[PDB]
Design goal:
Helix content: under 10%
CATH superfamily: Green fluorescent protein
Radius of gyration: 18 Å
Family: Belongs to the GFP family.
Strand content: over 45%
GO biological process, one term: bioluminescence
CATH class: Mainly Beta
Function: Energy-transfer acceptor. Its role is to transduce the blue chemiluminescence of the protein aequorin into green fluorescent light by energy transfer. Fluoresces in vivo upon receiving energy from the Ca(2+)-activated photoprotein aequorin.
Distance between the termini: 4 Å
Shape: globular
Organism: Aequorea victoria
Strand order of the largest sheet: 1-2-3-11-10-7-8-9-4-5-6
Order of helices and strands: EEEHEEEEEEEE
Subunit structure: Monomer.
Structural class: mainly beta
Number of domains: 1
Number of helices: 1
C-alpha cells in the first residue's frame, strides 16, 4: 500500500473486452469562467500495448483554455497491466457498465477545473462523456491567456484503493511548461467509483507510467489536438500486495 489497502479482488470479464483494438469516443461539455464550449474526440485504444490515439475538436469555435490542460480529462482502462498485476486492474473490471471519474484540478495561483465523467461501453465503443466546470480563473493568467506551450511531459499517476467506495483514488501534479520559460502547476485529485453493482478489482498500491505526445493536423481548419499515448501499470512486486 502507501495510501490505501486493497480489499481483495475476484471479478474478471471486462478484461476480455480489451483484448483487441477498441474504438474510443470522447464528448466534453464545459463552462470555464462563463465561457461555454464543447469538445468531441475519437480514436483507438489497444490496452494490450497500453496504446491510444485520439483526435479532439472544439466544435463550438475556439477552445477557451489551452489544449494541454484538458489532456487528463479527455480512459485509464486502456493502460497495459502486466500479467502479475492483472488482479489490480480496477478500470477494466468495472466494464462494460463502467465507472464514474471525478476530479478537481487546481491551477496554482489561478482557477480550478471541476470534472465529473462516465466511462463505459456503448455498443462496441468505449465512451468517455464529461461535464467540466472551471471557476476563479484570471482572465490574464496562463489558462485563459493561452500562455502554455503545446507539449506534454511524462507523468506517474499513483493509484490506491478506496474500499469505502468500492473504487480507487489518485493524486498527482501535472507540470505544464509556460511559454515564458516557467511552469504552470495543476494539482489533480481523482476519485473513481463503479457504475454497476457487480464485483470490481480493488488494487494494492501501484502507479501508471504515462507517456504523451501532442501534434496538429495540417488538413484541419478547426481548433484541434492530436494525442498519442502509452500507458503501462507498474510498481508492484509479483505475487504480493502492499
Amino acid at each position: 500500500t502507501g495510501s490505501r489497502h486493497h480489499h481483495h479482488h475476484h471479478s474478471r470479464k471486462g478484461e476480455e473486452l480489451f483484448t483487441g483494438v477498441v474504438p474510443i469516443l470522447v464528448e466534453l461539455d464545459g463552462d470555464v469562467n462563463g465561457h461555454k464550449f464543447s469538445v468531441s474526440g475519437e480514436g483507438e485504444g489497444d490496452a494490450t500495448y497500453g496504446k491510444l490515439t485520439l483526435k479532439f475538436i472544439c466544435t463550438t469555435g475556439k477552445l477557451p483554455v489551452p489544449w494541454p490542460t484538458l489532456v487528463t480529462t479527455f480512459v485509464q482502462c486502456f493502460s497495459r497491466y502486466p500479467d502479475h498485476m492483472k488482479r489490480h486492474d480496477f478500470f477494466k473490471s468495472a466494464m462494460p457498465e463502467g465507472y464514474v471519474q471525478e476530479r478537481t484540478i487546481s491551477f496554482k495561483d489561478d482557477g480550478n477545473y471541476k470534472t465529473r465523467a462516465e466511462v463505459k461501453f456503448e455498443g462496441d465503443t468505449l465512451v468517455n462523456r464529461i461535464e467540466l466546470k472551471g471557476i476563479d480563473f484570471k482572465e490574464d493568467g496562463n489558462i485563459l491567456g493561452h500562455k502554455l506551450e503545446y507539449n506534454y511531459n511524462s507523468h506517474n499517476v499513483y493509484i490506491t484503493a478506496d474500499k469505502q467506495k468500492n473504487g480507487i483514488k489518485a493524486n498527482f501534479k501535472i507540470r505544464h511548461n509556460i511559454e515564458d520559460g516557467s511552469v504552470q502547476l495543476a494539482d489533480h485529485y481523482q476519485q473513481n467509483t463503479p457504475i454497476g453493482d457487480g464485483p470490481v478489482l480493488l488494487p494494492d498500491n501501484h502507479y501508471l507510467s504515462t507517456q504523451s505526445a501532442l501534434s496538429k493536423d495540417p488538413n484541419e481548419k478547426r481548433d484541434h489536438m492530436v494525442l498519442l499515448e502509452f500507458v503501462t501499470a507498474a510498481g508492484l512486486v509479483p505475487r504480493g500486495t502492499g
